[PDB]
Amino acid sequence: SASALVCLAPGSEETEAVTTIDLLVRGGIKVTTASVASDGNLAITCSRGVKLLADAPLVEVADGEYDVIVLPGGIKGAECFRDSTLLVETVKQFHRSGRIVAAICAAPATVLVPHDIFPIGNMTGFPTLKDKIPAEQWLDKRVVWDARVKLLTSQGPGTAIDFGLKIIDLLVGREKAHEVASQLVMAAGIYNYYE
Amino acid sequence: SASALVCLAPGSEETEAVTTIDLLVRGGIKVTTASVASDGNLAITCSRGVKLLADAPLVEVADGEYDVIVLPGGIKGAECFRDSTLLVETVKQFHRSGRIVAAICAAPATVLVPHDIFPIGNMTGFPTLKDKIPAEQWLDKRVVWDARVKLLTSQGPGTAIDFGLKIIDLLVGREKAHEVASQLVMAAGIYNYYE
């Protein structure tokens, strides 16, 4: 019965968003995609021109029963997220209500830091944006999970598998993470959750 | 400069398709997505439910100036490709005219082998479908490039980066492939075009 809300804005990074969605569905997690900062328009043009159709406007789904809210990166998508009062409030509400916030690539530095959503609490993001993340919070790691604040972060398009697998591990369990990983033909240095 | 025709069908594997498109654009390759939906529909529902929009129906663009035709996997999307006379015709024409055919995951075994498009040449594909590739052609490599017949194949969602980078190497060159790789935060077991 686990579910995820995956946010999409103009300029979101399509590999990050789609890889994550696909893995979550492979993990048996129900995914809803939400259009952010488009006044309800479901057509989203991503950072390298891939066009997606979101399921619903964020304002219609923000109050639902999801276990995780996912913020893909892509600098311009992340800026839309940052500048959306609804997005920011929804992320805060997910946190305060004991749910997971998952953010990749530009999203940590661009969305979470300026709004002080997670002012203590370990976090990563795209490495060339390292300086935008407070020194004491930064870790240069493919995926960072801070259970104290239920914050999952990750670094880039190439870490989207690692990111999605950790969401599965947290929501469904290790066995299912391995089941999913085992069918992807993953590169050798990525953790596969085996026994 | 270089261009790529990326085919899409109902049931295409969205991580494979989108990762490839993203990397090709990062490589400076002009990408056109073509719907192989039998009715010409462009709003494609992929294998895990992601809704992608194709630029054009295949009939309108099959005759274009492209250096490579790319066949994503996904079982039902590859079946659509196999069962499309225009798709098969187009792949044969790319091959006979000295251009590249690139196929990942289910596409080699489902599209290429039944139509005997490559009676000679090394190929890979999704490992659980290995028995569907003639033993004399099968290799268990993340990416297989057979220059003799200009056939590029790859194995799964987790090899989509490897696949896309090799397309860049072939269409643009090693420098650009390395440039793109270096932006991704990719895992250590993916060749990064250094040396």
From Swiss-Prot, chains A, B:
List the EC numbers from the record: 3.1.2.-, 3.5.1.-, 3.5.1.124
> Active site annotated at which positions?
C105 (nucleophile)
The entry lists its GO molecular-function terms as:
protein deglycase activity; protein homodimerization activity
Record field: catalytic activity:
N(omega)-(1-hydroxy-2-oxopropyl)-L-arginyl-[protein] + H2O = lactate + L-arginyl-[protein] + H(+); N(6)-(1-hydroxy-2-oxopropyl)-L-lysyl-[protein] + H2O = lactate + L-lysyl-[protein] + H(+); S-(1-hydroxy-2-oxopropyl)-L-cysteinyl-[protein] + H2O = lactate + L-cysteinyl-[protein] + H(+); N(omega)-(1-hydroxy-2-oxoethyl)-L-arginyl-[protein] + H2O = L-arginyl-[protein] + glycolate + H(+)
Against CDD domains, the record matches this protein to: GATase1_DJ-1
Q: Record's Gene Ontology CC terms? A: cytoplasm; cytosol
**Deletion consequences:** Cells lacking this gene display highest sensitivity to carbonyl stress. The yajL mutant (but not the parental strain) suffers from a 100-fold decrease in viability after incubation for 48 hours in LB medium containing 0.6% glucose, and the mutant is rescued by YajL- and DJ-1-overproducing plasmids. The wild-type strain displays a small quantity of glycated proteins after overnight culture in LB medium supplemented with 0.6% glucose, whereas the yajL mutant displays much higher levels of glycated proteins, and also higher DNA and RNA glycation levels.
Post-translational changes noted in the entry: Cys-105 is easily oxidized to sulfinic acid.
Gene Ontology biological-process entries? cellular response to oxidative stress; DNA repair; protein refolding; protein repair; response to heat; ribosome biogenesis
Q: Which residues carry the post-translational modification Cysteine sulfinic acid (-SO2H), per the record?
A: C105
Q: Which UniProt keywords apply?
A: Chaperone, DNA damage, DNA repair, Hydrolase, Oxidation, Stress response
Describe regulators of its activity.
Answer: Glyoxalase activity is inhibited by zinc ions. Active as a chaperone in both its reduced and oxidized states, and is more active in its oxidized form.
- What is the recorded function of this protein according to its Swiss-Prot or TrEMBL entry? Protein and nucleotide deglycase that catalyzes the deglycation of the Maillard adducts formed between amino groups of proteins or nucleotides and reactive carbonyl groups of glyoxals. Thus, functions as a protein deglycase that repairs methylglyoxal- and glyoxal-glycated proteins, and releases repaired proteins and lactate or glycolate, respectively. Deglycates cysteine, arginine and lysine residues in proteins, and thus reactivates these proteins by reversing glycation by glyoxals.
Quaternary arrangement and interactors, per the entry?
Homodimer.
Q: Which family does it belong to?
A: Belongs to the peptidase C56 family.
The protein's name is Protein/nucleic acid deglycase 3
To which species is this protein native? Answer: Escherichia coli (strain K12)
